[PDB]
Amino acid sequence: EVDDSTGYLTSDVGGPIQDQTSLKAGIRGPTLLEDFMFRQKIQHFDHERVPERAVHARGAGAHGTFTSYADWSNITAASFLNATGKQTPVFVRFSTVAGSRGSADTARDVHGFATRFYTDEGNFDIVGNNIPVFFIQDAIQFPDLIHSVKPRPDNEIPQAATAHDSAWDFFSQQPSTMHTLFWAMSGHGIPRSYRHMDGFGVHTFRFVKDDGSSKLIKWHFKSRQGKASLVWEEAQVLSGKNADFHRQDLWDAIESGNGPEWDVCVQIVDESQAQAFGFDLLDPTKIIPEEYAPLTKLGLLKLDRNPTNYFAETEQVMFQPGHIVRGIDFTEDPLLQGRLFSYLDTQLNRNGGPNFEQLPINMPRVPIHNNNRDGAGQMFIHRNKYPYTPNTLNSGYPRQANQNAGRGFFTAPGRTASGALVREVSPTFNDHWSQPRLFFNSLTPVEQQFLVNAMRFEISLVKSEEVKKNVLTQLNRVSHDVAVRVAAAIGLGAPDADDTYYHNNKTAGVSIVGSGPLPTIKTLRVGILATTSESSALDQAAQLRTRLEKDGLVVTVVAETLREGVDQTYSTADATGFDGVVVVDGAAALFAASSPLFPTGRPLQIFVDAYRWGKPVGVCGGKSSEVLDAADVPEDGDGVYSEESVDMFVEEFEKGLATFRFTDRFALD
Amino acid sequence: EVDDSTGYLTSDVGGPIQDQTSLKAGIRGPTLLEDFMFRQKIQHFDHERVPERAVHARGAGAHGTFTSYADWSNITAASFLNATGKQTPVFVRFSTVAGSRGSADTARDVHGFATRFYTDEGNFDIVGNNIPVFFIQDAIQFPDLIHSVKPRPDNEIPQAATAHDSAWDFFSQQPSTMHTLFWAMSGHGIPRSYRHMDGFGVHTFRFVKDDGSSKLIKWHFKSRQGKASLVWEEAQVLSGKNADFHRQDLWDAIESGNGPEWDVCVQIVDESQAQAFGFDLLDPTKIIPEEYAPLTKLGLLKLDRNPTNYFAET
Amino acid sequence: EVDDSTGYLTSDVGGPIQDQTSLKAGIRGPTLLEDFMFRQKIQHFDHERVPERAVHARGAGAHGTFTSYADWSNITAASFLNATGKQTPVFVRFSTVAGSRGSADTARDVHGFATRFYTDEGNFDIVGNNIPVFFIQDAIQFPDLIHSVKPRPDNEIPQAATAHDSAWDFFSQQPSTMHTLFWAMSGHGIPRSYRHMDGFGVHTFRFVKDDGSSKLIKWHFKSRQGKASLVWEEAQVLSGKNADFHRQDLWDAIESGNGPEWDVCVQIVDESQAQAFGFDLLDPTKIIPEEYAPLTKLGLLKLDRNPTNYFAETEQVMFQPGHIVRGIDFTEDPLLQGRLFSYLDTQLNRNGGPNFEQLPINMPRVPIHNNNRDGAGQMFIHRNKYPYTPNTLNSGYPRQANQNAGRGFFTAPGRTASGALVREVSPTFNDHWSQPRLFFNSLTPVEQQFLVNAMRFEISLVKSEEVKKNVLTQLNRVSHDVAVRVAAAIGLGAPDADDTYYHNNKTAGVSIVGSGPLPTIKTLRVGILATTSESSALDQAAQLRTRLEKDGLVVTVVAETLREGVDQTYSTADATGFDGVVVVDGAAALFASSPLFPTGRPLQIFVDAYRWGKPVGVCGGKSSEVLDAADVPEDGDGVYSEESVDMFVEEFEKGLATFRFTDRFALDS
Ligand code: HDD
Ligand code: HDD
Ligand code: HDD
Ligand SMILES: *[C@@H]1O[C@H](CO)[C@@H](O[C@@H]2O[C@H](CO)[C@@H](O)[C@H](O)[C@H]2NC(C)=O)[C@H](O)[C@H]1NC(C)=O
Ligand SMILES: *[C@@H]1O[C@H](CO)[C@@H](O[C@@H]2O[C@H](CO)[C@@H](O)[C@H](O)[C@H]2NC(C)=O)[C@H](O)[C@H]1NC(C)=O
Ligand SMILES: *[C@@H]1O[C@H](CO)[C@@H](O[C@@H]2O[C@H](CO)[C@@H](O)[C@H](O)[C@H]2NC(C)=O)[C@H](O)[C@H]1NC(C)=O
Ligand SMILES: *[C@@H]1O[C@H](CO)[C@@H](O[C@@H]2O[C@H](CO)[C@@H](O)[C@H](O)[C@H]2NC(C)=O)[C@H](O)[C@H]1NC(C)=O
Ligand SMILES: *[C@@H]1O[C@H](CO)[C@@H](O[C@@H]2O[C@H](CO)[C@@H](O)[C@H](O)[C@H]2NC(C)=O)[C@H](O)[C@H]1NC(C)=O
Ligand SMILES: *[C@@H]1O[C@H](CO)[C@@H](O[C@@H]2O[C@H](CO)[C@@H](O)[C@H](O)[C@H]2NC(C)=O)[C@H](O)[C@H]1NC(C)=O
Ligand SMILES: *[C@@H]1O[C@H](CO)[C@@H](O[C@@H]2O[C@H](CO)[C@@H](O)[C@H](O)[C@H]2NC(C)=O)[C@H](O)[C@H]1NC(C)=O
Ligand SMILES: *[C@@H]1O[C@H](CO)[C@@H](O[C@@H]2O[C@H](CO)[C@@H](O)[C@H](O)[C@H]2NC(C)=O)[C@H](O)[C@H]1NC(C)=O
């Protein structure tokens, strides 16, 4: 860490200098080439930027700790997992997928959840998503998916969005994507925060024990903050009012001592069970339903420290599934296999040189011993002058590590191969439609509506008639109902039911709106709409504040202008900034009326928006009975709150915050 | 231009190949290092990105032409300006300033208006803004302005916005910025489209005649579509509903045969007049009011062709 | 520093691994993409190389220290010079100019001598040559000089040599080069070692005192090992027998506790004296003769520590004249001015990124305080989150440093400008011929012959008749005699004398052969030619060894095969490996064939040594007679014949100090 709280300005080589005026030939003359102060400064600036990540360019990171719950030697040799209470430092970056690095957090997308464990046996990375399955079955297709999903290559439109022709052209021609597509079209595509979503490794990996035996595994990071998501119409507005919403959220949660937590869990099954669930476990388009393999909680992951320099830490972190430790191994998942190549090659693009593992954030916490040398940006001075193997001149050091010596990584010895070298897809990968259906069946009826609606939204922006038809064809193969309802919005006939993959099987834990109330309401944001006219209004506010802040909520009092007790103005305020909204009684005048200090109708607009997006809304005070009829909000409606007793208003409101979304306000087909 | 409307897939060295399945050691086996089809394709993908521009990362471009209205030998030796009706191909890119790639077009910012004339005497670039004056008086200060205006370096917040402490800390400590600040806080901060804004060179330049004599000049690109701007509360929503608004707009105007146009104009004054208007003409925080030096229309700039590949061109 | 003397092989992120066999699908099967051990290792290897330096690609470096002799506050504000006995660590790299990084050390070239002082006020670099003047008067011409001097762009021939058409086309068309060209054609073009050459800053710089006043200066680094140089015919062989000669020499000198030393000196003159010596001091093609400004010894520079990793230290060191400290300033030397731009720009090519000053070898020894951020390979984590000026949010830190605060660098306030902006050469720069003549006049008659011979050698390799004529024209303007003698070798008539610049002025200190005996003979190499037949031969050798090694010499006993007391075989031996050669009496048989060395080798070594002007001798009884067989005159200067071992050494050591016996070389008539 470099401290600049005191001192005089120096060059990068420590010579004291100034940097405010160019060196000129006369007070009104031209600048001199010999002005090294100028050039060193501007050269640095000119070279500040590096290529953004090819995918997941938009994201944010934090420091934390992983703690093991036990000694898991019975399932894996992995050292970070070998003792009860063992603590490994971590760094996690969350991201969206398609958007470039300045795009909105709240676009609809799959989300990245990438975790580095800095273990005492090397760095170990789990590079996953908030959605447990992926669009494609072979890594070689990654550029096809990503090309089609990103902006059109002629005009680079649209940013951060699947709502254009090429994406759906791809989805409709590559049916493997149905499952992920359904996930992304649910609320999983627009989470309320990084803290309110899960992490998944997607691929099946292997646990390996010192005796060389292996089980097949799936990683799950389950959120202790619960599952929550935005509604589309709210996410759209948020993207404009606050492109930084998710990163501000994570930053804030950590600053206020509310670090988010996840249970790091696995599903464990036998090698013999590769095909025992009606699909191939090497297929990254499928989940093992919880019904057939329960989750084991391995340890606790907690984020509790924000970075100091975003660029140096978040932007430079370079994850790799290649960063593997003794106790884990890969599987023949053709998606996972290709990823191994990609993540090593891409960092050359991003770092511009081969020594990217030497950046502080990428360094391990244990010693390095190997014969890698040179390369641009070499930061080490190697003492071993015989960097070859086998040598006698350095006494045959460094020694080879393997199964039986030095705790070397080793491939699971059970793994075998047979047959021809082929560029052919396994027939066991061919069912693209069952699991999407399983997923859809497991959602509440409103969740289903929202999913249909997301699809209606996007498909209607697809210009090509032929592409829309092919979309309906694939959708129909998952559910005729879904096809029909989607087709209705784009004025086409859904094709005739095809029931080859229809079924009524459900699975638990994939639903957001059906996962019951949030386990905690700490850090949720409450907006209090007040005024500077009535002296009573601000007093009501101040009292709600004390009571709400006591329960860990984040309170904003809104008024026409700033002063003591007021956090922000109606001008800068918006419903998307709040999880619930409270109007204090004394502000009734404002909801019934114009001001040069905010746009017309703003105070009411905030409230009405909050209600229409399914949020806990309420009026607190005497004339509360009547402020609602003016606002056109039903007094008896679920999650609408009307009370005089401050203590009983809070108590009622806090129940609404836990329910989080009031689903009765949304029309069904 | 490379055509791919017919043919079989080839490597970059023209060997016909496939790219849909990895080469595996058995139908349910691991992928082979020797699969050159895979590695050449993924290597390309892994390396697609280049660093975004340090400022003006968010922007869009179009092809057009410039036509001279006269032989301007009386004021400059500049060849693209030396004949009535002389056509020079152009390429223009418009942009915002602070936002990264992917930030919304309708953030509040200064805007870039950058023109290349591919003249018969070399490429000539006028790299300007939609606002005729700039925040600072010395280029050595550029990183201070830009650091303060871009997101906070600890958390990269906020994107594409001067609405935070550091920006105003800078503006309040570096008063030279008041003029541009005022412009950016007007509707000039949030134009209705690229077509409904002007271009300015900002700095004073010199016209030079073959005899060696020089006048001082200021470039103005006056919009023939007129000036229009959004309202804030509208701009905010638009940033969410359509981050691509300005680029969609320009693309569409061109597709539909309504290419935007600008009169390329200059103010011309004498070397002796450097300090005759109550400020120094070397000061890029100042305009010469039209009341003291009228504009001369030099020619017409028109954009009428969209690019074929955004990356390769824009 | 990274220690690898013990431990198990790890990846760059510390995971223990092996690196000797690829992961294969079956014992006789193809290699797997998932083999991360393989790819990380090979990626590193594939990326080990960086671009070589655009010029001075072939060089070598060492660590040392500089000691000040006094408090020089009376002439400069420069802190590393502000106290008697003040020590500053240094790093120096010496080089040739034209050759690529694998070319021989002993090509004929100008030589680099670049010094970094890691001062307590910032890094300060003096980037100089072994020759005090440069070919051209404006930096903008540097690519022209270098293109013409390097290999031809069609076939890339010849390596490391001015002996081709383009070089002499340029020299003949750009007469400014005469002066340097004469130096390079002297023995200065082929120094005996880096240790036996001087360093020069070339340009006039300024010393600046805290009161703002300035003197004009010239840096001289005078060698405490004395000046010595090879002869051409010897250099050519050495290039083949040992491309690494100079670097070997420097390495060895330092390993054996004989670190080379230089007196760091300046010439100091007044601003008013800019044109007071009959040339413009801004002209880098001119010297201030010692007769008109004596040298002041400022301190001692000593090299005493070899690097640990060549690549990491020597290859990655990045010098810049822009690395200046308070107390020194630039002058309007149009060559110096351009260099300021180049050296900052070129490091982007070499390092591939803007953070090159963060490489350990380039870091300063004091803190860094500035607002430079980000860039590829950013190795710091900055704590100051308000990296702009002016700020209040970091209390206006870092503070501007200048003349009166913070010990800032500052431009000499006396410096002024006037007139028009012009791309024109000052008329004061127009005399390209006098100083070369001054130089030539100041060499011993043999030194003159050698220079003529070097010119005869090269010009005869110039294919083009027209270019040869234009060369003669330029040479003639310096000296008719030189033109005449050179013309004689290429069969052309020298043009008629032109005396505009002829004169007989001499200057001291520019001659090598006339600089008297060496002040030390420590580290010089002596070859003893012996045999394994006569038991007496090896006993003679062993006794010479003890005696010679006692005086700091490096001794090699040569025989047909190796054994105790024998350092190398006749097979691997050559005259170029020795500064003097001794045949022991008992080996006479060998000098009058064997499958253990090429025919005639033992005599070839001796005869070569004699013909190249080296101290040669036979030690023993029948010494009288071994010489007549060898055809070496017994009475000849630097030929030694004695029976008394103690007397032989004593005589021989005088010859080693004389170093070269110039009476063996024919002169013109
Ligand atoms: C064959 C190419 C390829 C394939 C099939 C995948 N990825 Fe990937 N991914 C990349 C190629 C890539 C990449 C181009 O190599 C990136 C971009 C920058 C980087 O570090 O690696 C990347 C980045 C990246 C990041 C950003 C990490 C960060 O924050 O820096 C996450 C979270 C993921 N990926 C997650 C996945 C998941 C869950 C996948 C499905 C199993 C997946 N990727 C398939
Ligand atoms: C000392 C540095 C510096 C200063 C004082 C300025 N600029 Fe700049 N500008 C840059 C350094 C820079 C740059 C970092 O060099 C950029 C970024 C990428 C590039 O190609 O140049 C750039 C980009 C850039 C672009 C984008 C062109 C494109 O779309 O590719 C425009 C229109 C401008 N600038 C215009 C200006 C104007 C009108 C200025 C005030 C009169 C100005 N810049 C001051
Ligand atoms: C503007 C072009 C230019 C001009 C006129 C010069 N140089 Fe230079 N020099 C460079 C541009 C350059 C360079 C291309 O930037 C190098 C190559 C590698 C590097 O870092 O700087 C360099 C390398 C270089 C090195 C090697 C440093 C090392 O060992 O790493 C020395 C010793 C010199 N130069 C010395 C000089 C002297 C004594 C000159 C005459 C006064 C001179 N150069 C003129
Ligand atoms: C592997 O080891 C852990 C050791 O704790 C086992 O987990 C425990 O299982 C018992 C019942 O068998 C529970 O009462 C404990 O609470 C569990 N502890 C934890 C931390 O979960 C685990 O069952 C073993 N698994 C296998 C397959 O052998
Ligand atoms: C858990 O893993 C750690 C790290 O690998 C083990 O501790 C290291 O063991 C090696 C060799 O056995 C020692 O030479 C190191 O000094 C150890 N490090 C420390 C901090 O003790 C540890 O033994 C493992 N524990 C279990 C129960 O298997
Ligand atoms: C719907 O659910 C049933 C019951 O869970 C599934 O039937 C099981 O499938 C597995 C895997 O092939 C068999 O080995 C089990 O023994 C079956 N159990 C029972 C009770 O029938 C069925 O596969 C599911 N159908 C779909 C389309 O997912
Ligand atoms: C430079 O020459 C142009 C070229 O004609 C002059 O512009 C013309 O001015 C007259 C009236 O003064 C008009 O009839 C023409 O139509 C003008 N043409 C254009 C394109 O403006 C111009 O006035 C001259 N300017 C100077 C300063 O000498
Ligand atoms: C306007 O500029 C063009 C381009 O410089 C001029 O035409 C050139 O004139 C030169 C020298 O007289 C010819 O050798 C070139 O071949 C011409 N180039 C081309 C592309 O045609 C023209 O003379 C200029 N017109 C005026 C009025 O000054
Ligand atoms: C600057 O100060 C130094 C410090 O002593 C002077 O160096 C001495 O000069 C006197 C002659 O004037 C000699 O007797 C000493 O032997 C010198 N010592 C050294 C180490 O050089 C130096 O002369 C002064 N120079 C000027 C220009 O005032
Ligand atoms: C010689 O060298 C250093 C130049 O920095 C001086 O020591 C510094 O002196 C100032 C006092 O003015 C302090 O603020 C610095 O912190 C000191 N630095 C170090 C590294 O010791 C010293 O003053 C100079 N001596 C002379 C005689 O000028
Ligand atoms: C040869 O040496 C003489 C003697 O110093 C030089 O003539 C002097 O030059 C200096 C500097 O220009 C003048 O101040 C004197 O007036 C001259 N002195 C005498 C005594 O004549 C001459 O410049 C030298 N010539 C060359 C070509 O180097």
CSV table of C-alpha atoms in Angstrom, one decimal, chain B residues 40-242:
chain,number,residue,atom,x,y,z
B,40,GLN,CA,-7.3,-20.7,-33.0
B,41,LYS,CA,-10.9,-19.7,-32.5
B,42,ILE,CA,-10.8,-19.2,-28.8
B,43,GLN,CA,-7.4,-17.4,-29.0
B,44,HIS,CA,-9.1,-14.9,-31.3
B,45,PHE,CA,-12.0,-14.5,-29.0
B,46,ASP,CA,-9.8,-14.1,-25.8
B,47,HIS,CA,-8.0,-11.3,-27.6
B,48,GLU,CA,-10.8,-9.4,-29.2
B,49,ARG,CA,-10.7,-6.5,-26.8
B,50,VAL,CA,-8.4,-3.5,-26.9
B,51,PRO,CA,-8.2,-0.7,-24.2
B,52,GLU,CA,-11.1,1.8,-24.5
B,53,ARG,CA,-10.1,5.5,-25.2
B,54,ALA,CA,-8.8,7.2,-22.1
B,55,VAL,CA,-11.6,9.8,-22.5
B,56,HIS,CA,-14.5,9.7,-25.0
B,57,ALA,CA,-14.8,5.9,-24.7
B,58,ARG,CA,-18.5,6.1,-25.6
B,59,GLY,CA,-19.1,7.3,-29.1
B,60,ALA,CA,-20.3,6.5,-32.6
B,61,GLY,CA,-19.2,7.3,-36.1
B,62,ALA,CA,-20.2,7.8,-39.7
B,63,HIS,CA,-18.8,8.3,-43.2
B,64,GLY,CA,-19.6,11.4,-45.3
B,65,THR,CA,-18.1,14.1,-47.4
B,66,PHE,CA,-17.1,17.7,-47.2
B,67,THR,CA,-17.7,20.1,-50.1
B,68,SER,CA,-15.9,23.5,-50.3
B,69,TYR,CA,-17.9,26.6,-51.2
B,70,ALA,CA,-15.0,28.5,-52.8
B,71,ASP,CA,-11.3,28.8,-53.5
B,72,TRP,CA,-10.1,30.0,-50.2
B,73,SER,CA,-6.5,30.8,-51.3
B,74,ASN,CA,-7.0,34.4,-50.0
B,75,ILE,CA,-7.1,33.1,-46.4
B,76,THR,CA,-5.3,29.7,-46.4
B,77,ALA,CA,-3.1,27.4,-48.6
B,78,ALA,CA,-5.1,24.4,-47.5
B,79,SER,CA,-5.7,22.3,-50.5
B,80,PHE,CA,-9.1,20.7,-49.5
B,81,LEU,CA,-10.3,24.3,-49.4
B,82,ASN,CA,-8.8,25.5,-52.7
B,83,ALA,CA,-11.7,25.1,-55.2
B,84,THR,CA,-15.4,25.7,-55.4
B,85,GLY,CA,-17.3,22.4,-55.1
B,86,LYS,CA,-14.1,20.4,-54.1
B,87,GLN,CA,-15.1,17.1,-52.4
B,88,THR,CA,-13.1,15.5,-49.6
B,89,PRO,CA,-14.2,12.2,-48.0
B,90,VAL,CA,-14.7,12.5,-44.2
B,91,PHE,CA,-15.2,10.3,-41.1
B,92,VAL,CA,-16.7,11.7,-37.9
B,93,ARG,CA,-17.0,10.3,-34.5
B,94,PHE,CA,-19.2,11.8,-31.7
B,95,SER,CA,-18.9,10.8,-28.1
B,96,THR,CA,-19.4,11.8,-24.4
B,97,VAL,CA,-16.3,12.3,-22.2
B,98,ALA,CA,-16.3,10.6,-18.8
B,99,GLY,CA,-18.2,7.4,-19.3
B,100,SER,CA,-16.7,4.0,-20.2
B,101,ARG,CA,-17.7,1.9,-23.1
B,102,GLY,CA,-21.3,0.8,-22.5
B,103,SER,CA,-22.3,3.9,-20.4
B,104,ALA,CA,-25.4,5.7,-21.5
B,105,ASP,CA,-25.4,8.2,-24.4
B,106,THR,CA,-27.7,10.6,-22.5
B,107,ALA,CA,-25.5,11.2,-19.4
B,108,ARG,CA,-24.8,14.8,-18.7
B,109,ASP,CA,-21.4,15.6,-20.3
B,110,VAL,CA,-19.3,17.5,-22.7
B,111,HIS,CA,-19.5,15.9,-26.1
B,112,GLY,CA,-16.9,15.1,-28.7
B,113,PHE,CA,-17.2,15.9,-32.3
B,114,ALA,CA,-14.1,14.7,-34.2
B,115,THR,CA,-13.7,15.0,-37.9
B,116,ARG,CA,-11.2,13.5,-40.3
B,117,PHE,CA,-10.8,15.0,-43.8
B,118,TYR,CA,-8.9,12.6,-46.0
B,119,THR,CA,-7.5,15.4,-48.1
B,120,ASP,CA,-5.4,15.1,-51.3
B,121,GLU,CA,-2.6,16.7,-49.2
B,122,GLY,CA,-2.8,14.3,-46.2
B,123,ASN,CA,-5.2,13.4,-43.5
B,124,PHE,CA,-6.4,16.5,-41.5
B,125,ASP,CA,-8.3,16.1,-38.2
B,126,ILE,CA,-10.3,18.6,-36.3
B,127,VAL,CA,-10.8,17.2,-32.9
B,128,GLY,CA,-13.5,19.2,-31.2
B,129,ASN,CA,-16.4,19.4,-28.7
B,130,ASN,CA,-20.0,20.4,-28.8
B,131,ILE,CA,-19.1,23.1,-26.3
B,132,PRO,CA,-16.7,25.8,-27.5
B,133,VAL,CA,-14.6,26.2,-24.3
B,134,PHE,CA,-12.7,23.8,-22.1
B,135,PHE,CA,-12.3,23.3,-18.3
B,136,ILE,CA,-8.6,24.0,-18.0
B,137,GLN,CA,-5.8,26.3,-19.3
B,138,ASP,CA,-2.9,23.9,-19.4
B,139,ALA,CA,-2.7,20.3,-20.8
B,140,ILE,CA,-0.6,19.2,-17.9
B,141,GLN,CA,-3.8,19.5,-15.8
B,142,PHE,CA,-5.8,17.1,-17.9
B,143,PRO,CA,-5.3,14.1,-15.6
B,144,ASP,CA,-6.4,16.1,-12.6
B,145,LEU,CA,-9.6,17.2,-14.4
B,146,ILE,CA,-10.2,13.7,-15.7
B,147,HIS,CA,-9.4,11.8,-12.4
B,148,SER,CA,-11.7,14.1,-10.5
B,149,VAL,CA,-14.6,13.8,-13.0
B,150,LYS,CA,-14.4,10.0,-13.6
B,151,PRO,CA,-15.6,7.5,-10.9
B,152,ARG,CA,-14.0,7.4,-7.4
B,153,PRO,CA,-10.9,5.3,-7.6
B,154,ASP,CA,-11.7,3.3,-4.5
B,155,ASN,CA,-15.1,1.9,-5.6
B,156,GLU,CA,-15.5,3.2,-9.3
B,157,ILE,CA,-18.6,5.1,-8.5
B,158,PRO,CA,-20.4,6.9,-10.1
B,159,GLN,CA,-20.4,6.0,-13.8
B,160,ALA,CA,-20.6,8.8,-16.4
B,161,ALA,CA,-21.4,11.7,-14.0
B,162,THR,CA,-20.0,14.8,-12.4
B,163,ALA,CA,-22.5,14.4,-9.5
B,164,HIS,CA,-20.0,13.6,-6.8
B,165,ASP,CA,-17.5,15.1,-4.4
B,166,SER,CA,-14.3,15.0,-6.3
B,167,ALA,CA,-15.6,16.6,-9.5
B,168,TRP,CA,-17.0,19.6,-7.6
B,169,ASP,CA,-14.0,19.7,-5.3
B,170,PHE,CA,-12.0,20.2,-8.5
B,171,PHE,CA,-14.3,22.7,-10.1
B,172,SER,CA,-14.4,24.8,-7.0
B,173,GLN,CA,-10.7,24.8,-6.6
B,174,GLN,CA,-9.9,25.4,-10.3
B,175,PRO,CA,-12.1,28.3,-11.2
B,176,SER,CA,-11.0,28.2,-14.9
B,177,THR,CA,-13.7,25.5,-15.2
B,178,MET,CA,-16.7,27.8,-14.5
B,179,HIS,CA,-17.2,28.6,-18.2
B,180,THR,CA,-17.4,25.0,-19.5
B,181,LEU,CA,-19.2,24.0,-16.2
B,182,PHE,CA,-22.0,26.4,-17.0
B,183,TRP,CA,-22.2,25.1,-20.6
B,184,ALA,CA,-22.3,21.5,-19.4
B,185,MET,CA,-25.0,22.3,-16.8
B,186,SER,CA,-27.1,23.9,-19.6
B,187,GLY,CA,-29.0,21.8,-22.2
B,188,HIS,CA,-25.7,21.6,-24.0
B,189,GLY,CA,-24.9,18.8,-21.5
B,190,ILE,CA,-27.8,16.7,-22.8
B,191,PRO,CA,-28.4,17.3,-26.5
B,192,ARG,CA,-31.3,15.7,-28.3
B,193,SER,CA,-29.0,14.0,-30.7
B,194,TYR,CA,-25.5,14.3,-32.2
B,195,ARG,CA,-27.3,15.9,-35.2
B,196,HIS,CA,-28.8,18.7,-33.0
B,197,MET,CA,-25.5,19.9,-31.7
B,198,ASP,CA,-22.6,22.0,-33.0
B,199,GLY,CA,-18.9,21.3,-33.2
B,200,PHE,CA,-16.1,23.5,-32.1
B,201,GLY,CA,-12.3,23.4,-32.4
B,202,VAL,CA,-12.1,25.2,-29.1
B,203,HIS,CA,-8.5,26.4,-29.5
B,204,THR,CA,-7.4,29.3,-31.7
B,205,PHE,CA,-5.5,27.9,-34.7
B,206,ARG,CA,-3.8,29.8,-37.6
B,207,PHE,CA,-4.7,29.9,-41.3
B,208,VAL,CA,-1.5,30.3,-43.4
B,209,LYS,CA,-1.2,31.4,-47.0
B,210,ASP,CA,1.5,30.4,-49.5
B,211,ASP,CA,3.2,33.8,-49.0
B,212,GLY,CA,3.7,32.9,-45.3
B,213,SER,CA,1.2,35.2,-43.7
B,214,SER,CA,-1.2,34.1,-41.0
B,215,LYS,CA,-4.6,35.0,-39.5
B,216,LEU,CA,-5.9,33.6,-36.2
B,217,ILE,CA,-9.0,31.3,-36.5
B,218,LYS,CA,-11.7,29.4,-34.6
B,219,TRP,CA,-13.6,26.5,-36.1
B,220,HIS,CA,-17.4,26.3,-35.8
B,221,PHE,CA,-19.5,23.4,-37.2
B,222,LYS,CA,-23.1,24.8,-37.3
B,223,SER,CA,-25.9,22.2,-37.3
B,224,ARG,CA,-28.3,22.4,-40.2
B,225,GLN,CA,-30.8,20.4,-38.1
B,226,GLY,CA,-31.0,23.1,-35.5
B,227,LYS,CA,-30.3,23.0,-31.7
B,228,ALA,CA,-32.4,20.8,-29.4
B,229,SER,CA,-31.9,19.2,-26.0
B,230,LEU,CA,-33.6,16.8,-23.6
B,231,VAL,CA,-34.8,17.6,-20.1
B,232,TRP,CA,-32.9,16.1,-17.2
B,233,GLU,CA,-35.7,14.0,-15.8
B,234,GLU,CA,-36.2,12.6,-19.3
B,235,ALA,CA,-32.4,12.0,-19.9
B,236,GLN,CA,-32.2,9.9,-16.8
B,237,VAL,CA,-35.0,7.6,-17.9
B,238,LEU,CA,-33.7,7.4,-21.4
B,239,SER,CA,-30.3,6.2,-20.1
B,240,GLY,CA,-32.1,3.2,-18.7
B,241,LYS,CA,-34.7,2.6,-21.4
B,242,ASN,CA,-32.1,3.1,-24.2
